[PDB]
Amino acid sequence: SEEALKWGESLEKLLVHKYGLAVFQAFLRTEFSEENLEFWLACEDFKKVKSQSKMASKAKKIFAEYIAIQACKEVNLDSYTREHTKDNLQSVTRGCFDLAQKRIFGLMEKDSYPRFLRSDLYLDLIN
Template sequence: MACETYKKIASRRGRISRAKKLYSIYIQPQSPREINIDSSTRDAIIKNIQEPTQTCFEEAQKIVYMHMEMDSYPRFLKSEMYQNLLKTVQSQSS
C-alpha cells in the first residue's frame, strides 16, 4: 500500500521526502518494519534514493507480493485461526 501511495506523488520534492521515509521504515537494515528483499534490490533502491523515480520501489513491491503469494498466504489459509473462522462462517450459513 505504501508503494501504491508513493507512485501517485507528482512532485519531485514530495517523492524524495517520501522515498527517504519508506527507506527508513521498510528497506534500511534493522528498520522497524524491514521487508525481506535481496541485497541487489536493496542496493538498487539505495542507489536511486537521491533521485527517486515513481517506480524505484517496484521491484521490492514485487518481491513482497511473491513472498505473500508463495508463503504467507498459504500459511494463513492453513492456520488454526482461519480454519476456526471458516467453520464459524460455514455453520452460520447452514
C-alpha cells in the first residue's frame, strides 16, 4: 500500500505525488470541488514559467478560467483576493497568485483533504 500512507502525512506531501494527485482529484470530483486542485496546479506550472511574455499571458489565461466571476472553472475567492489578483495582472511577477493560491490551499487543507482521508478511495489503498 505504502506510497498511499505518505499522502496522509500532510496535504503538502499528497500534492507532490503523481498518483496521490490523480486519486485526490477523483475524490474532489465526487464532491464537485475538483477546480480547487486544478487551479492550485495551474498556479504551480505558472510559477515555473521562465518567459515574461509567457508569464503574463499564462497569468491572463489562469485568471479567465479560474478567477473571473462566472468562469467555467470558478473557484471560491473573496472580493479582497479576487481584486488583488486582478490588480497583479497589470505587471505580472511570480507572486501574482500567491494570495489566491494560499486561500484555495487553505480550503483543501482544512475541508476536503480530511474528508479524502476518510474516503474509500483513500482507505482502500492503505489496507
